[PDB]
Amino acid sequence: SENLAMKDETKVEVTSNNSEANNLRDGNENTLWVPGQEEEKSVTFDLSKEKDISAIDIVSKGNSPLKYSIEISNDGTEWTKIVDENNNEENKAVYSNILKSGKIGRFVRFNFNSENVKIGEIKIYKG
Ligand SMILES: [Ca+2]
């Protein structure tokens, strides 16, 4: 159902190329966020409040299989890594992940460790 990434109250921070940051949540899979060569390419969503998070899609437009992890937090200091695909070699257009029942968080952080990362969209579904 509802895509929290596109809620007005949701803010987004990126480790590079801030000019393209809103491309992560504009509802258009072909508008991309393409990070530069920083060692830790990362995106953090602040949902503004602690919310139910049921599922997450990452639309990956680059050539290489995406290597990534997903972390969540309530206070923004203590993080729980809920998906760890840093060694992934599977090549998919969309990397979907369904969360355990009852997962909540205010912050959702995405770390990308592959090459040619180009993210068309990140969708964070509440139930
Ligand atoms: Ca987009």
Cα-based distances in Å from 106 to 36, 44, 47, 84, 95? 26, 10, 5, 19, 21
Residue at 22: amino acid letter: N
Count of domains in the chain? 1
What's the gap in Å between 117 CA and the centre of ligand 1?
14
Identify the CATH number of the domain in which residue 16 sits: 2.60.120.260
Nearest to 68 by CA among 123, 105, 114, 33: 114
Q: Are 56 and 70 in contact (CB under 8 A)?
A: yes
The boundaries of the domain holding residue 65 are: 1-127
Please state the three-class secondary structure of the chain as a single string: CEEHHHCCCCEEEECCCHHHHHHHHCCCCCCCECCCCCCCEEEEEEEEEEEECCEEEEEECCCCCCCEEEEEECCCCCCEEEEEECCCCCCCCEEEEECCCCCEEEEEEEEECCCCCCEEEEEEEEC
Cα-to-centroid distance, 1 and ligand 1 (Å): 18
CA 124 to ligand 1 center in whole angstroms: 13
Alpha-carbon Rg for the chain, nearest whole angstrom, is: 13
What experiment produced this structure? X-ray
In eight-state DSSP terms, residue 100 is: P
**60 vs 106: CA distance, rounded Å:** 24
- Which residues have beta carbons under 5 A from ligand 1 (an ion)? 23, 26, 28, 31, 121
